[PDB]
Amino acid sequence: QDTLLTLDTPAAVIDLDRMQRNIARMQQRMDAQGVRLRPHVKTSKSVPVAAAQRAAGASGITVSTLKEAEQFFAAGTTDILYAVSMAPHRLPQALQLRRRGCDLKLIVDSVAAAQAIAAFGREQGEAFEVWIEIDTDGHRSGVGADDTPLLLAIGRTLHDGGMRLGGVLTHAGSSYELDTPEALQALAERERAGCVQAAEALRAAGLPCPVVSVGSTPTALAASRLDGVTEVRAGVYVFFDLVMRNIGVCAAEDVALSVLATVIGHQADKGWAIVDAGWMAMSRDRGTARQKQDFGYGQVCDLQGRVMPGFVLTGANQEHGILARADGAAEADIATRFPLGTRLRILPNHACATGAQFPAYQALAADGSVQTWERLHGW
Amino acid sequence: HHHHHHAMSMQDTLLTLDTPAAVIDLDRMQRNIARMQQRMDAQGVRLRPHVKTSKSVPVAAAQRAAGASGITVSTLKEAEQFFAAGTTDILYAVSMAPHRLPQALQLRRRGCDLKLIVDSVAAAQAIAAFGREQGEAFEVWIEIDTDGHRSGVGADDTPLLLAIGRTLHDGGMRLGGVLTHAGSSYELDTPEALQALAERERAGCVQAAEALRAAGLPCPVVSVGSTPTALAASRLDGVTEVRAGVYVFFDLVMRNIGVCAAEDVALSVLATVIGHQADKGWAIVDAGWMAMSRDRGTARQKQDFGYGQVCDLQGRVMPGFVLTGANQEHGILARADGAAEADIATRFPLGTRLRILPNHACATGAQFPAYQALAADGSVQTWERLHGW
Ligand SMILES: Cc1ncc(COP(=O)(O)O)c(CN[C@@H](C(=O)O)[C@@H](C)O)c1O
Ligand SMILES: Cc1ncc(COP(=O)(O)O)c(CN[C@@H](C(=O)O)[C@@H](C)O)c1O
Ligand SMILES: [Mg+2]
Ligand SMILES: [Mg+2]
Ligand SMILES: [Mg+2]
Secondary structure, eight states, X not given: OOBTTTSOSSEEEEEHHHHHHHHHHHHHHHHHHTOEEOOBGGGTOOHXXXXXXXXXXXXXXXXXXXXXXXXXXXXXXXXXXXXXXOOGGGHHHHHHHHHTTOEEEEEEOSHHHHHHHHHHHHHHTOOOEEEEEEESSSSSSSEETTOHHHHHHHHHHHHHTTOEEEEEEOOOGGGGGOOSHHHHHHHHHHHHHHHHHHHHHHHHTTOOOOEEEEOOHHHHHHOSOOTTOOEEOXXXXXXXXXXXXXXXXSOGGGOOEEEEEEEEEEEGGGTEEEESOOHHHHOSXXXXXXXXXXXXXXXXXXXXXXXXXXXXXXXXXXSOEEEEETTSOXXXXXXXXXXXXXXXXXXXXXXXXXXXXXXXXXXXXTTSBEEEEEOOOOO | OHHHHHHHHHOOBTTTSOSSEEEEEHHHHHHHHHHHHHHHHHTTOEEOOBTTTTOOHHHHHHHHHTXXXXXXXXXXXXXXXXXXXXXXXXXXXXEOOGGGHHXXXXXXXTTOEEEEEEOSHHHHHHHHHHHHHHTOOOEEEEEEESSSSXXXXXXXXXXXXXXXXXXXXXXXXXXXXXXXXXXXXXXXXXXXXXXXXXXXXXXXXXXHHHHHHHTTOOOOEEEEOOHHHHHHOSOOTTOOEEOOOGGGTOOHHHHHHTSSOGGGOOEEEEEEEEEEEGGGTEEEXXXXXXXXXXXXXXXXXXXXXXXXXXXXXXXXXXXXXXXXXXXXXXXXXXXXXXXOOTTHHHXXXXXXXXXXXXXXXXXXXXXXXXEEEEOTTSBEEEEEOOOOO
């Protein structure tokens, strides 16, 4: 019988009741907007996490690598969008997945990448499904939402080239820089409007564009309306994290992934407890540093998961985390409060970064038992 | 020659690997291994490399073949993997947690000469009571704080050293030594300050061992080291071994501390260009922070390299171009000086392969299930490494 007292530390624990509440909150919001949810599994890369998202009503998945496409397809999921601008050298891998039965969709934002796909498809007998990525907020990839000549030149390359022009997609990743409901709502409207504008421009040119796909977790939870959109992609919401708490779309109490750690020593004069969760456990992500409340390398909670405001990991080496007062003072008699061997749970800055440090999650049930749920590492 | 012809057909190079990949330039790696071992031989001290930078059996095998004595590990899973691969002299250099004692016992009962460390009377009492119960005289070293980096017993705290050392010795354990790590060396960037810190690290660790021996307690090993202080110490009188790990590859944090050049950096991430934002001067590559890690140790140093220094496919630095930003699977390649490069698409065409030098080799390596060990003939081989605990 494995439980939080028996596991070695550090371990990545998913509180299944918290995870199920986050899954239902997002699916209920997408149902209220009349759109499909295509979760981004790059947050967990774990078959049972994605199975719970499917069981609640999700439609297909988004993946960040073809390794995730291979994993999820070998587990029976066939409706897979690889939402990273396609590199031509990966075309043989993509072809072999489609010929095996995976309905794998690729994305592009240039004439040259569309040309490479379409020439390879014609040669190989494969009508690849490709969507066009639209830049709606200046974050990263994509055809500018008002760069119509580029949008139509790519769309005609794919459609006249014998490929299946399946849709447009955008990701308003600048939402991570926001922290008010008004700014998130307005960005969610800019994301929706730009993605719909590109679809209408394709359709107006006589090109197919059946899918309009938007999303980030903060804009998926903030959008007031989603007219014109067929699906939303969101991923970090399945666990949440402290970055999301500071953006304002969840509370710390909603964060379903924590790192179980043991106190292995102290520095009494500085008021430090040293734990065995360093940055190799937490990752080096320090997304909260650029936000209105800095949580260091994570927020401390007790073994029951009660948040302990005011204690955070103020520093981290590879295998040692430094727990101390966030107010800078040296806690008096820190060893008397957290004796050697005490177990604590640390909430992460960024769930996608912390999860990737572990070979598996420990999925925590209501009775206190855990089941190990493997996840993917690498490419 | 059936095996030959098939092996040739299957052989990878930097053109045929999928990206991103973590590439070890084996010539650079061997130059780093010989440099550290020669330095320690010249100092008359053993080198006990810290394998937590690579966690890879062939990398440790190269360090052992060059003359290393034992290893340091950061987790008991590293002690399990390297003992199964034939390494018997292993120091687990993280404050021992009582609940890990059954795994440390099982490793010693299989034949691993595993050493543990402590820095408190309670951890010493837990080891000694488990060892008496189980009939095992564990070997334990006392960790010393010589530069305020983390924690450890103060080198001048005779009453706490004696109490921890008597708890282990009177308890029937083998008090085997003292160790320190002057991790504050990562904040320095001059040879004068590094040499001084390495002397403070030596002096304080020997001071602790001299105090234990003055009370009649054994303390035969005195172990010091970080890569920067190993390379800078003038003298090592009284020290029996040095531990250093990131030197096997180096990285840009080390280049900035000034103990290596960018051309000594033996680990790089092979990446492909997958797109552009022409008006911002950006090339997008498939090495984001999941490949590089989120480490940004160069941001507070003399030269900020973002998420890494861009090199061409031949490994040569392309000055002025860095990964200025990174999302999980996408890295943003742009000018470090903040200008928008003109014709970025012509400077970096779609499908171009590049190599990115890491901020911190320990952090970048852990993002990969294996390295691709690049030989002089351009051939790679997959060298697995450990992930997790
Ligand atoms: C293309 C694409 N679609 C959906 C998501 C999921 O966003 P959430 O994690 O906010 O739900 C992402 C996430 N991208 C991360 C990243 O590191 O790439 C970031 C840009 O916001 C995505 O890229
Ligand atoms: C206990 C111990 N010994 C040796 C080293 C190796 O130092 P280099 O990597 O500089 O050769 C370390 C390294 N510790 C890292 C860390 O992330 O823990 C840091 C404090 O320098 C060490 O801890
Ligand atoms: Mg994320
Ligand atoms: Mg390191
Ligand atoms: Mg284990």
